[PDB]
Amino acid sequence: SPDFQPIPSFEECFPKSTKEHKEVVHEESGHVLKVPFRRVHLSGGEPAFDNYDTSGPQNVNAHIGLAKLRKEWIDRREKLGTPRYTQMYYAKQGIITEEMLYCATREKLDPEFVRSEVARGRAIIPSNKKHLELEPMIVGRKFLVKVNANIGNSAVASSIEEEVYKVQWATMWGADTIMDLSTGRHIHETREWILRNSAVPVGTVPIYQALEKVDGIAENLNWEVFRETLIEQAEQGVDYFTIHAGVLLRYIPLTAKRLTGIVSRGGSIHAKWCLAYHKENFAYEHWDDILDICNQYDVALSIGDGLRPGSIYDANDTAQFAELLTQGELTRRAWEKDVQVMNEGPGHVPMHKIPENMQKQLEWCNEAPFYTLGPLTTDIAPGYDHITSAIGAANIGALGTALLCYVTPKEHLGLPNRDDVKAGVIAYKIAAHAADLAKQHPHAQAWDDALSKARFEFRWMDQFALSLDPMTAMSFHDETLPADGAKVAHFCSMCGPKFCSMKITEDIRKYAE
Amino acid sequence: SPDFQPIPSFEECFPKSTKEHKEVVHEESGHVLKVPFRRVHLSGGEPAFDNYDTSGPQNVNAHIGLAKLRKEWIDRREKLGTPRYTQMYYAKQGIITEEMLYCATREKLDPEFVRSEVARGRAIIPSNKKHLELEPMIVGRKFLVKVNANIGNSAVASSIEEEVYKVQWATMWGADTIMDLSTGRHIHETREWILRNSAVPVGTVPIYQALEKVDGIAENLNWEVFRETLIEQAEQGVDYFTIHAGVLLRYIPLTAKRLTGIVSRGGSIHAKWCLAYHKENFAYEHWDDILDICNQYDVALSIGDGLRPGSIYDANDTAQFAELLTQGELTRRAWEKDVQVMNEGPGHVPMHKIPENMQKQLEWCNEAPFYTLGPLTTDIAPGYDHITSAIGAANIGALGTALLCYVTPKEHLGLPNRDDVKAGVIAYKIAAHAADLAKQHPHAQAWDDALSKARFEFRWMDQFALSLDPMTAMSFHDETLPADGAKVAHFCSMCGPKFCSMKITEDIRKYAE
Ligand SMILES: Nc1ncnc2c1ncn2[C@@H]1O[C@H](CSCC[C@H](N)C(=O)O)[C@@H](O)[C@H]1O
Ligand SMILES: Nc1ncnc2c1ncn2[C@@H]1O[C@H](CSCC[C@H](N)C(=O)O)[C@@H](O)[C@H]1O
Ligand SMILES: O=P(O)(O)OC[C@H]1O[C@@H](n2ccnc2)[C@H](O)[C@@H]1O
Ligand SMILES: O=P(O)(O)OC[C@H]1O[C@@H](n2ccnc2)[C@H](O)[C@@H]1O
Ligand code: SF4
Ligand code: SF4
Ligand SMILES: [Cl-]
Ligand SMILES: [Cl-]
Ligand SMILES: [Zn+2]
Ligand SMILES: [Zn+2]
């Protein structure tokens, strides 16, 4: 029994907000779905503003875990009987599942549209039938751009208590998925506590634990070890697996002249094994067997980019695109077995090289959802790689990337702590939303408009309440003007009362009456 | 005599770096120029890495001020005699000045190319002949993307001591220009201390002090008051003036349906005056008289964007582009009198609307340098507008914007302090450099490559030394691994020794021998 400690409350993080749920009925089953959202309560006759909410159920004892909200859905489908358990299988049969309706409601889009996007491979709903605690969400270019937060220990740092805190904290600030990338002690146990306490999808990179199972000797990996690890993780409820099946033996020499070589953790492990034996990647060789596992649980496959560029110098090189071509082949093969797929992308990429990345992925991978690590647009600022990569992530998101893997201020430096997790999630929520606006995604600008209206009207508390991080905005304002009266003042300390342009506009318009 | 206190030393901010100067001779005059740069001293047989340096002369008593390095240049040109004193006038005569050669050396480009860019109006060298302390720099699309830091007091906050600290601090971290936007007490005096202690160009918005001269009553402004303010500021050495001469009477009603109205400080002041009298903007009316002042000192004109959008809702609206059209007219008129010009741009602009901004400016303003405030790509994150705008600034910089006005974490909330100044400069140096890479600017990637080589080779101290903010990178790494031995370890706490991909690549390549 770990010594779990609670994260700050929803109310402390989001003053004037309440957690709400929209109730809808899944017509085929009669199941009632409670789809979460938040409501920001405003002043001055403004209607309350409703926003997305990933924070999940609050104040739940981590020793007990979250309610198993999906239980009746899974039980009913098992009793009906089915050859495959994936959302893509159901979508292709013409079935709108509870998960699809839940996502449609959450996205304010039609359930049939969700079904269509899943059936055609252009969106995924990562939702292992063993992750009963999950509040379903959808990843795809036609939907809100989503953010992943990476957490997990290393052999050098952290603990079970701290990782559970970090999952709850990441989702509080807007993480849409998390991955447990633990490479230290207690891998299985850490992940069990996380899954039972995570309302968002949980991904892993199974080769990390496989390498642990063989005591860090990559040469002792093989398909059988890996297969056992896949089953173990699937049984716990992992919703998606990153698998570097595109790191082919013949692609490894393409990296010999790179400045930063192979920077992918899983990719480097596969490359070492391949070179040791001069054999083809065992995950590639056994792709069909991996698909058979995924079909029984609905584990989505996130096809890794083990040959992603780790420096600006290496961006968009032959190695990177050789792997992308193979990811497309693997994607099409997975779809033949109705397995949900997304593709992992770069990396360190300068801005002028970003469009080529999207163009090639959309074509070669038949519009499967893309999932990028940034990209970082420059190598010059370790300590600020949440900013160097927010630029790339926003750009590639605007071009169609569906899931943005965050990058924290600790990238290239060390394991992120709870503060770094928050900073990364905030930076990535900015990038994702900026991308939603650039895509003219329906109703995305309503958020900006509500905050800007509060800004123009000097409804300061409303402005703070509507923001991504209300207490930061409020505290920053109060550093110079802390008095209650200033929360209704028609200026702040930047310009002062006589130089505030919005107050001058106010008088300008008043005189125009 | 203010109680000036020193900023942290160059050595504390940039370990392993030295300040250096490249000596070149201005052939026409025989004047010897000492053009600053920094040198980062590296290990492992790497050559030292030379980078740009805006920090200026160090450890100089602010009561005494910087050396008047340009004195002999100005004195010689006065003795030769000239009708106009601007770099554009000299460039059009076919003269390569000390300023042009200094900039060429600093940019590693040909002096004739600098002259050509200035003569054609596509670059400016803001360099008032009364700012003798200035180390010349150039702003233009063909050059490194530059960053401006805004400082100054308000009626509500700050002091002379703190503003001088902030100028030295901003330039330490990479600010290429600063503006003294003081709207409180001691405007003249604050600016005098800043100019005498600033090695970078100093800009102002003269209407702010003009409004102060009439006790905050905009209706008591007029050309004469404004003219007196221009002369006062020019005499001190201000290198450029933001003047909102494109805020025309007939454009003001175009803002009536805006969500956030007129958010420009100077623009709102001009609009109030125009509406009060139903008269044309006096700065527009007296444009020719402003040009006559600028020609005697070489003050560059930064044509304001008083109708810039202050919310995503207002982006790229009729008001904004009406003003842009007028900025082009004003630009061409200024060039007829050989006055150097840049144009100010937005603002709050979603990413998909950024290209239109650049396309219109390049055409309508005949490729004059563009100077943007961001743009902010979303309104949702006050407290993090250095990040929301770094995205926009990088994008618009990649498309050709020459000067990026920073935005600090205090934007929309209060007056930035010294910490916020650093944060804004860092974010903007990232955006500017990312833009340099996207433009494939010569030798820009050498910086990224040097840091990435140090990263791959586990030369940790070199990696930190090469970064934008060495002590942040070092401290962050040391939070988990503080021991000296870890500075040569082939891993960090993110992956640990057995999962470090670069170490695995290392072994992979070693085995390949
Ligand atoms: N335990 C953990 N917690 C948080 N992020 C992790 C993590 N383990 C791995 N990651 C993420 O996975 C990455 C792989 S290790 C280094 C990756 C390299 N910088 C690159 O460009 O790809 C880390 O940088 C981090 O982004
Ligand atoms: N004294 C000062 N110190 C630092 N920045 C200042 C400043 N005075 C003005 N500024 C800058 O000038 C801006 C004008 S006031 C508000 C501008 C508004 N947010 C907009 O979108 O245009 C400030 O937001 C800040 O960016
Ligand atoms: O094992 P590697 O380094 O490839 O993966 C590290 C992390 O990076 C994420 N990622 C995303 C895109 N490319 C990589 C991936 O999902 C996992 O979270
Ligand atoms: O008076 P206004 O608000 O226009 O200008 C505020 C600041 O913003 C800068 N700016 C840059 C582009 N548009 C505006 C301008 O140079 C000055 O630093
Ligand atoms: S004083 Fe300036 S920064 Fe503050 S609310 Fe008014 S316009 Fe915005
Ligand atoms: S351990 Fe991981 S994060 Fe640290 S240097 Fe190695 S690859 Fe980079
Ligand atoms: Cl690294
Ligand atoms: Cl504001
Ligand atoms: Zn990296
Ligand atoms: Zn603004």
Numbering used by the authors:
A (entry chain A), B (entry chain A): 79 to 591
Paper quotes:
ThiC, the enzyme discussed here, catalyses the complex rearrangement of aminoimidazole ribonucleotide (AIR) to 4-amino-5-hydroxymethyl-2-methylpyrimidine phosphate (HMP-P) in the thiamin biosynthetic pathways of bacteria and plants 17 and is an example of a non-canonical radical SAM enzyme. The homodimeric structure of Caulobacter crescentus ThiC (CcThiC) showed a (β/α)8-barrel fold and suggested that the cluster-binding domain, which was disordered, resides near the C terminus and inserts into the active site of an adjacent protomer through domain swapping. The cluster-binding domain inserts into the active site of an adjacent catalytic domain through domain swapping as previously predicted.
Zinc when added to AtThiC at a 1:1 molar ratio during crystallization largely displaces iron at the additional metal site. In the high-resolution crystal structures of AtThiC containing SAH, the average Fe…S distance from the iron covalently bound to Cys573 is 3.5 Å (range 3.3–3.7 Å) with an average Fe…S-C angle of 165° (range 162°–169°). The three crystal structures determined for AtThiC with bound IRN show that IRN adopts the same binding mode observed in the previously determined structure of CcThiC that lacked a [4Fe-4S] cluster.
